[PDB]
């Protein structure tokens, strides 16, 4: 994936 | 006066979520980056697929054009940035030195520098010609969500999940200003206004704010959309009426009147979070792009 397409964990 | 943006094209081809779309300064192209590790180039006016640019080993969160429309820079989970020649598709330089995901990037107007922000909490300034890192700013205490040069390149604005926006002197790397606001919710996006006097900042409390960073005063707020989770791009639309444009986590594009802050249009048709929007430099055209359940780019056109 890509960081921008994920939520903060 | 309200716009009448209508869907004209849907651009398929990315195999994972889009991360961002940007129009080339000369208006000819749209560049898209995706979690699928690829950049794609499209005709800005007809959506015609033009080419695929590859080489990053992990997904890409951001992509930006040089002022002459000839180069791109991309920011990837593989901890590098890449500088690409658009006409040939070749990777001209790989920018190494971040220790975690690179999240955001931008050229300065001169296009001899690149600014980047990363999960490693740093902002880096890179020499375009050599690909070398000129400066590492300990900019923030959490991931850097956005970085943008001002209109003459003397300033950089950065935003972070630490709740801060910071203005930096490009030449020295020194911090000129820290903007804090309320209880400092994560700042998910920032950019300068076209005249350089303001910054538009998104926070993960469903809010956009127009700031005179020069005085530290919030001039406008834009609300009614959903933004609690993702770093969604916002824009100034200046080709017709003066709008603010943003994606939203309810799958819509929102358009606000800049002065009155009223919503003037909501663009429906994406089937997932609209992670990214861009405004065409000369025509009333919006590009929008969405996450995993959609993976498409849409081009919308308006009479004003």
Numbering used by the authors:
A (entry chain C): 40 to 48
B (entry chain A): 31 to 334
The authors write:
pmcWDR5, a well-established core scaffolding protein found in histone methyltransferase complexes MLL1-4 and SET1A/B, was initially characterized as an epigenetic histone “writer” to recognize histone H3 lysine 4 (H3K4) and is essential for H3K4 di- and tri-methylation (H3K4me2 and H3K4me3) to activate gene transcription. Two separate and non-overlapping sites located on opposite surfaces of WDR5 mediate most of its interactions with binding partners: an arginine-bearing cavity located on the surface known as the WDR5-interacting (WIN) site, and a shallow cleft on the opposite side referred to as the WDR5-binding (WBM) site. In mice, methyl-CpG binding domain 3 isoform C (MBD3C) interacts specifically with the histone H3 binding protein WD repeat-containing protein 5 (WDR5) and forms the WDR5-MBD3C/Norde complex. The residues Val31-Cys334 of WDR5 are visible and consist of seven WD40 repeats that form a seven-bladed β-propeller structure.
Several structures of WDR5 in complex with a series of mutated MBD3C peptides were determined to comprehend the underlying molecular basis of the WDR5 B site recognition. In comparison to the wild-type MBD3C, the dissociation constants were approximately 4-fold and 6.8-fold higher when Phe47 was mutated to alanine and histidine, respectively. In addition, a new water molecule is introduced into the vicinity of WDR5 Cys261, leading to the formation of a hydrogen bond network that closely resembles the one observed in the WDR5-SET1B structure. Thus, these data indicated that MBD3C Phe47 is crucial for the opening and recognition of the WDR5 B site. We further confirmed that Phe47 is important for WDR5 binding through the substitution of phenylalanine with alanine or histidine.
